[PDB]
Design a protein around this nucleic acid. Structure first.
Ligand SMILES: [Mg+2]
Ligand SMILES: [Mg+2]
Ligand SMILES: [Mg+2]
Ligand SMILES: [Mg+2]
Ligand SMILES: [Mg+2]
Ligand SMILES: [Mg+2]
Ligand SMILES: [Mg+2]
Ligand SMILES: [Mg+2]
Ligand SMILES: [Mg+2]
Ligand SMILES: [Mg+2]
Ligand SMILES: [Mg+2]
Ligand SMILES: [Mg+2]
Ligand SMILES: [Mg+2]
Ligand SMILES: [Mg+2]
Ligand SMILES: [Mg+2]
Ligand SMILES: [Mg+2]
Ligand SMILES: [Mg+2]
Ligand SMILES: [Mg+2]
Ligand SMILES: [Mg+2]
Ligand SMILES: [Mg+2]
Ligand SMILES: [Mg+2]
Ligand SMILES: [Mg+2]
Ligand SMILES: [Mg+2]
Ligand SMILES: [Mg+2]
Ligand SMILES: [Mg+2]
Ligand SMILES: [Mg+2]
Ligand SMILES: [Mg+2]
Ligand SMILES: [Mg+2]
Ligand SMILES: [Mg+2]
Ligand SMILES: [Mg+2]
Ligand SMILES: [Mg+2]
Ligand SMILES: [Mg+2]
Ligand SMILES: [Mg+2]
Ligand SMILES: [Mg+2]
Ligand SMILES: [Mg+2]
Ligand SMILES: [Mg+2]
Ligand SMILES: [Mg+2]
Ligand SMILES: [Mg+2]
Ligand SMILES: [Mg+2]
Ligand SMILES: [Mg+2]
Ligand SMILES: [Mg+2]
Ligand SMILES: [Mg+2]
Ligand SMILES: [Mg+2]
Ligand SMILES: [Mg+2]
Ligand SMILES: [Mg+2]
Ligand SMILES: [Mg+2]
Ligand SMILES: [Mg+2]
Ligand SMILES: [Mg+2]
Ligand SMILES: [Mg+2]
Lengths: 51, 203, 99, 148, 193
RNA sequence: UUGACCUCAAAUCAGGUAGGAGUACCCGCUGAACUUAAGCAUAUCAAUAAGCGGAGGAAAAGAAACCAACCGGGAUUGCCUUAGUAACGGCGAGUGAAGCGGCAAAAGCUCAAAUUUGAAAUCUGGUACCUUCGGUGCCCGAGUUGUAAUUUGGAGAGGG
RNA sequence: GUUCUUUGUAAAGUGCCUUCGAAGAGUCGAGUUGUUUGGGAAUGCAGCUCUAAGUGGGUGGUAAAUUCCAUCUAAAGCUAA
RNA sequence: UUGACAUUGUGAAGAGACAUAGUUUC
């Protein structure tokens, strides 16, 4: 009966995911993170819907 | 019908005609065995409003149990414990003498189901009862959409679990504010009330 | 009733266009019946009175109707039934030994 | 997390920061609220004046609900009109057409009078009112309509 | 065991409470199961929806009677009104309740119209068993919401008759309080010979 | 002398049933003390442990002798809440529920008490045959000290 | 989804009119003892004594008398989730 | 152990009251 899960405020859950999305642009960040993107045209990388 | 008369007549227990009957009948019973088969109801109107029916498969037993308090067993009254617990002698027992009645016939007749039971008489020493029983292997019963519920195994020894009406009585099974403790069934409801309930995301 | 339409006071509460429902028979569990009247009247003159009922009408005959109640309230449950019981005895006496 | 906890730091010292002389023992004060009126009375008078004995009347089978009656001050009131609909009424404040506010419907029980509502007329439907509440409302040329 | 300026606590942990700790680890599990059950039922239950038609009903007590809320079943009066008998109504996915009573006409009408809507908006396939298969809508309740009745207009003229609200309450309170006394004054004043 | 009935017996009589086990969970009985109160007896631990009887895949509960006091609700069970609250309590230590509201699931009914009285209309068994979880024919038997149909309070019955 | 026997001079639902309308007792209830409960002039359960009525009866969380009001229909029974 | 109530019924004499008819109590 140890506490295993944790409750985060829904709003602040969103601040973080929003935050996290914004960083997938910022290419320094992406590079920093592992991720081999010196080759890639531009960031955000948007590919066709045909995918 | 005659049962209506019977019913009303049986409510005049201090009436001359009844105290006569009562006096004879209660001596007769006391001569027989403490548990004995009854040829028929001595109260055909009570029996029948209680589920009885005069087809094969329906059985009546007459049993007498001792009256008074439950003398707490224990050697020489010694209680070994706190003083609130030292009582021995004004101690009273939670089921009814009617329950004991059912339970002894029910034992005596394991192949029957106890259906219900009514009071018939008493003196200073015994209360006497007629217990109405059903044979659930009797096809007269097993057929018969109305009584064949009693044929299921959930109804094994109902009297031993307080599922007959007396049992339901002392178990305190009734709706209302007066029955909060004991109603979905006191031990089970107590447990509920002393169960801790922790959620994954703690409330 | 009619409610006043305000939140305190005598006929407190919201005005609603009212209805009054068809009546329940279960609301009539007490009622006599000519069958039950008859049977009961018959059983009575079969079985007669009982010890406390005999003492009761003596007490009425020989000591009034207030001391009759006082005893009958100890005998039976309570004052209301005792009320009702003296009454019944009163009308055994009238009916019988009088008219 | 155990990681940031002071016992990790106390490892290596004899007494776990509970003292050589006075130790850490099972229950020196006794357990619980014990000694309330004796060796723990200094802490209970101060910090908890009023703890022992009784005051008013018992109430068997009190049903909170019976007494349900939230308060709303004139302080707000105008909040119970939706934002856009609101400015509509503040300007063009008049009899003949003044906003109805069902404060019951908004889940309030009594209107109290905390302070200053503009001179717009309102029609105010409530279960109860502060004598001032009603007064102030009237001074803006609105009224109060008692409901249930 | 008393110290500092702390609140007095009340943690009832003096029984063998660790024997009755229910951790809902099975939360996710039960939801899943709960969900499957519903998918079985809807499947089994043919085209019928997963619930029954419930009535509007004004809630009880002083605290909730501003709101209105689904009842249990429709009342023998409402069913009759709506042009069907109880037995049948029960087989058509309408809930009926021999307990509930009608005293408020607004609600009574409400419900009778609730039933009229339903009947028109359902379709009862013949007994024959010929089964013109035709599409399960799952919630009676979704399809026939229960809204709160509109109790006034938005804006309206100010009518101030003069007597204040506050005072009418004090006066009302009063009249009730001394109701008994004044009756005893009037009783006794009769026994003036 | 013969034949019934009532009640009570016997049989290696025809067919069946109960025991014991398991017992996490379920329905009852019975029933502690350690402990806490900084001592202790009421209290507490606890309507707990140990003892006893009884079931099932769940058990129990259940279609109101309910809740309310409202504009009233509407079988039972459970969850979130009500609430560490009303209340109990050497009013000490401690204890401690319910109604409303939201949700999960939903489902409703059976007798007794009634003259079929122009027809016991009901049923166990044996037997033979069959299309065998059963059916029909026939015969013992049950049963009027009442077995069917009809009625269950929401109603409902008889006459028109 | 098909196929065969039509269960029938059988069974059921509904409107009006008239007369009825049977409803559980050593129980309800009461006193007392004991236990139990948050339940407090007594929450349930049990023992012994008393023991009902039928426009009655039970409940309405402060005992009692009086007068009303509200609300159910006990002392028998089945039932999935 | 002692009292009351219940198990508890039937006659006869004697006391006890509506206040010197017999229901009732010893
Ligand atoms: Mg027999
Ligand atoms: Mg002991
Ligand atoms: Mg004790
Ligand atoms: Mg004897
Ligand atoms: Mg409790
Ligand atoms: Mg936390
Ligand atoms: Mg920590
Ligand atoms: Mg760590
Ligand atoms: Mg570290
Ligand atoms: Mg350090
Ligand atoms: Mg250091
Ligand atoms: Mg170190
Ligand atoms: Mg150091
Ligand atoms: Mg330290
Ligand atoms: Mg040390
Ligand atoms: Mg020292
Ligand atoms: Mg305190
Ligand atoms: Mg404010
Ligand atoms: Mg706890
Ligand atoms: Mg688990
Ligand atoms: Mg559903
Ligand atoms: Mg078909
Ligand atoms: Mg044999
Ligand atoms: Mg066994
Ligand atoms: Mg114990
Ligand atoms: Mg321990
Ligand atoms: Mg402890
Ligand atoms: Mg101690
Ligand atoms: Mg100590
Ligand atoms: Mg000690
Ligand atoms: Mg205790
Ligand atoms: Mg045990
Ligand atoms: Mg099994
Ligand atoms: Mg099953
Ligand atoms: Mg299940
Ligand atoms: Mg069951
Ligand atoms: Mg049951
Ligand atoms: Mg009913
Ligand atoms: Mg309910
Ligand atoms: Mg405290
Ligand atoms: Mg306790
Ligand atoms: Mg709810
Ligand atoms: Mg069913
Ligand atoms: Mg009944
Ligand atoms: Mg006990
Ligand atoms: Mg008690
Ligand atoms: Mg009273
Ligand atoms: Mg109602
Ligand atoms: Mg039955």
């Amino acid at each position: 009966w140890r506490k295993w899960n944790v409750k985060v405020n829904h709003n602040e859950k969103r601040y973080a995911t929003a935050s996290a999305i914004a960083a997938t642009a910022v290419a320094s960040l992406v590079l920093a993170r592992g991720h081999r993107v010196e080759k890639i045209p531009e960031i955000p990388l948007v590919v066709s819907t045909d995918l | 019908g005659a049962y209506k008369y019977l019913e009303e007549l049986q409510r005049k227990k201090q009436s001359d005609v009844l105290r006569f009957l009562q006096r004879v009948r209660v001596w007769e019973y006391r001569q027989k065995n403490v548990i004995h088969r009854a040829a028929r109801p001595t109260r055909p109107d009570k029996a029948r409003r209680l589920g009885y029916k005069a087809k094969q498969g329906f059985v009546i037993y007459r049993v007498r149990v001792r009256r008074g308090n439950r003398k707490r067993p224990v050697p020489k009254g010694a209680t070994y414990g706190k003083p609130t617990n030292q009582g021995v002698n004004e101690l009273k027992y939670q089921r009814s003498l009617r329950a004991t009645a059912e339970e002894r016939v029910g034992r005596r007749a394991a192949n029957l189901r106890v259906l219900n039971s009514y009071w018939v008489n008493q003196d200073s020493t015994y209360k006497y009862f007629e217990v109405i029983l059903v044979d659930p292997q009797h096809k007269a019963i097993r057929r018969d959409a109305r009584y064949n519920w009693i044929c299921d195994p959930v109804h094994k020894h109902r009297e031993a679990r307080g599922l007959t009406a007396t049992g339901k009585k002392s178990r305190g099974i009734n709706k209302g504010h007066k029955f909060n403790n004991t109603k979905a069934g006191r031990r089970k409801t107590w447990k509920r009330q002393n169960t801790l309930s922790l959620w994954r995301y703690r409330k | 009733t009619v409610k006043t339409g305000i939140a305190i006071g005598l006929n407190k509460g919201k005005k609603v266009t009212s209805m009054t429902p068809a009546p329940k028979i279960s609301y009539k569990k007490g009622a006599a019946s000519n069958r039950t009247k008859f049977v009961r009247s018959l059983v009575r003159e079969i079985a007669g009175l009982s010890p406390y009922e005999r003492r009761l009408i003596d007490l009425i005959r020989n000591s009034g109707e207030k001391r009759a109640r006082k005893v009958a309230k100890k005998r039976l449950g309570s004052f209301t039934r005792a009320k009702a019981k003296v009454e019944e005895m009163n009308n055994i006496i009238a009916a019988s030994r009088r008219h | 997390p155990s990681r940031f906890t002071k016992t990790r730091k106390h490892r290596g010292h004899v007494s776990a920061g509970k003292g050589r002389i006075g130790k850490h023992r099972k229950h020196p004060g006794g357990r619980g609220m014990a000694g309330g009126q004796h060796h723990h009375r200094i802490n209970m008078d101060k910090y908890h004046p009023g703890y022992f004995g009784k005051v008013g009347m018992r109430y068997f089978h009190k049903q909170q609900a019976h007494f349900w009656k939230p308060v709303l001050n004139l302080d707000k009131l105008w909040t119970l009109i939706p934002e856009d609909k609101r400015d509509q009424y503040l300007k063009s404040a008049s009899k003949e057409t003044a906003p109805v506010i069902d404060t019951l419907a908004a889940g309030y029980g009594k209107i109290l009078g905390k302070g200053r509502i503009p001179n717009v007329p309102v029609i105010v439907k409530a279960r109860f009112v502060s004598k001032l509440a009603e007064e102030k409302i009237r001074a803006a040329g609105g009224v109060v309509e008692l409901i249930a | 065991a008393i110290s500092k300026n702390l609140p007095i606590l009340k943690n009832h942990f003096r029984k063998h409470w660790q024997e009755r700790v229910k951790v809902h680890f099975d939360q996710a599990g039960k939801k899943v199961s709960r969900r499957n059950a519903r998918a079985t039922r809807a499947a089994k239950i043919a085209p019928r929806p997963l619930d029954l038609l419930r009535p509007v009903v004004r809630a009880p007590t002083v605290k909730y009677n501003r709101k209105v809320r689904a009842g249990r079943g429709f009342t023998l009066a409402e069913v009759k009104a709506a042009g069907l008998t109880a037995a049948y109504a029960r087989t058509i996915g309408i809930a009926v309740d021999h307990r509930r009573q009608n005293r408020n006409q607004e609600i009574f009408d409400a419900n009778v119209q609730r039933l009229k809507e339903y009947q028109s908006k359902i379709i009862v396939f013949p007994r024959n068993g010929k089964a013109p298969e035709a599409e399960q809508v799952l919630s009676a309740a979704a399809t026939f919401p229960i809204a709160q009745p509109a109790t006034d207009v938005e804006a309206r003229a100010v009518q101030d008759n003069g007597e204040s609200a506050f005072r009418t309450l004090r006066l009302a309170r009063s009249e009730k309080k001394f109701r008994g006394i004044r009756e005893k004054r009037a009783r006794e004043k009769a026994e003036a010979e």
